[PDB]
Design a protein around this ligand. Structure first.
Ligand SMILES: C[C@H](C[C@@H](C[C@H](C[C@@H](C[C@@H](CCN1CCCC1=O)N1CCCC1=O)N1CCCC1=O)N1CCCC1=O)N1CCCC1=O)N1CCCC1=O
Ligand SMILES: Cc1nnc(C(=O)NC(C)(C)c2nc(C(=O)NCc3ccc(F)cc3)c(O)c(=O)n2C)o1
Ligand SMILES: [Mn+2]
Ligand SMILES: [Mn+2]
Length: 180
């Protein structure tokens, strides 16, 4: 195959359960983790960030949409919309907040945080879908300046993102990863 250094780093940087879910998500979209290795790394990163995020709240706060099968992911969205009356989002969100009663779109970008959110806001164009963006530089940006979780839970996410960046840069892999 294509013995890429990025593929072997991804498999040692993320735990096997995350790597397996990212592989299933890329193949479900008809893409190869062995060839498009940058999206392989990004898919694993978005996955771990979403799971660290759901771990920050109370025991029953979040329903995790990301990481499920696409058909079942929309099934839980139906049950949430049909039991709480919240409008149906057009695009698949990542979580649902049972405390604040809204869906959450979590993004991870290598550019400045207001770039990615500005694109996500245009694409979403829903209504109450909360947007929370993280950067690889340590910045974050959320809708209405409402960051949902307290500072500690968001801080350890920022620390992990910068650790992944350092490990990539130490392997001469950060430059190509940033240009995508
Ligand atoms: C619930 C089950 C799998 C969960 C996976 C998800 C990730 C969780 C893994 C746990 C273990 N921890 C915690 C310590 C490290 C670790 O590894 N965390 C959280 C931190 C990072 C991480 O990895 N969680 C959250 C609840 C328990 C659990 O396992 N998933 C997969 C996607 C949807 C989902 O809820 N489910 C549910 C049905 C299908 C399935 O497989
Ligand atoms: C429906 C629909 N049509 N296109 C999409 C889409 O947005 N796809 C991508 C793969 C681009 C994406 N998805 C999700 C997500 O949860 N879903 C992210 O959270 C996310 O960050 N990204 C980048 O969703
Ligand atoms: Mn998602
Ligand atoms: Mn997202």
């Amino acid at each position: 195959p294509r013995g890429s250094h990025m593929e072997d780093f991804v498999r040692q940087c993320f735990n096997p359960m995350i790597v397996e879910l990212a592989e299933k998500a890329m193949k479900e979209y008809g893409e190869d983790p062995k060839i498009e290795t940058n999206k392989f790394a990004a898919t694993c990163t978005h996955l771990e960030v979403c799971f660290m995020y759901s771990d920050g709240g109370s025991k029953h706060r979040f329903e995790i949409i990301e990481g499920r099968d696409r058909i079942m992911a929309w099934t839980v969205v139906n049950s949430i919309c049909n039991t709480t009356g919240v409008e149906k989002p057009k695009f698949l969100p990542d979580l649902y907040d049972y405390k604040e009663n809204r869906f959450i779109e979590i993004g991870v970008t290598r550019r400045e945080v207001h770039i990615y959110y500005l694109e996500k806001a245009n694409k979403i164009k829903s209504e109450k879908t909360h947007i929370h963006i993280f950067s690889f530089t340590g910045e974050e940006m959320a809708t209405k300046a409402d960051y949902t979780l307290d500072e500690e839970s968001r801080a350890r996410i920022k620390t992990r993102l910068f650790t992944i960046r350092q490990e990539m840069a130490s392997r001469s892999l950060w430059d190509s990863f940033r240009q995508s």
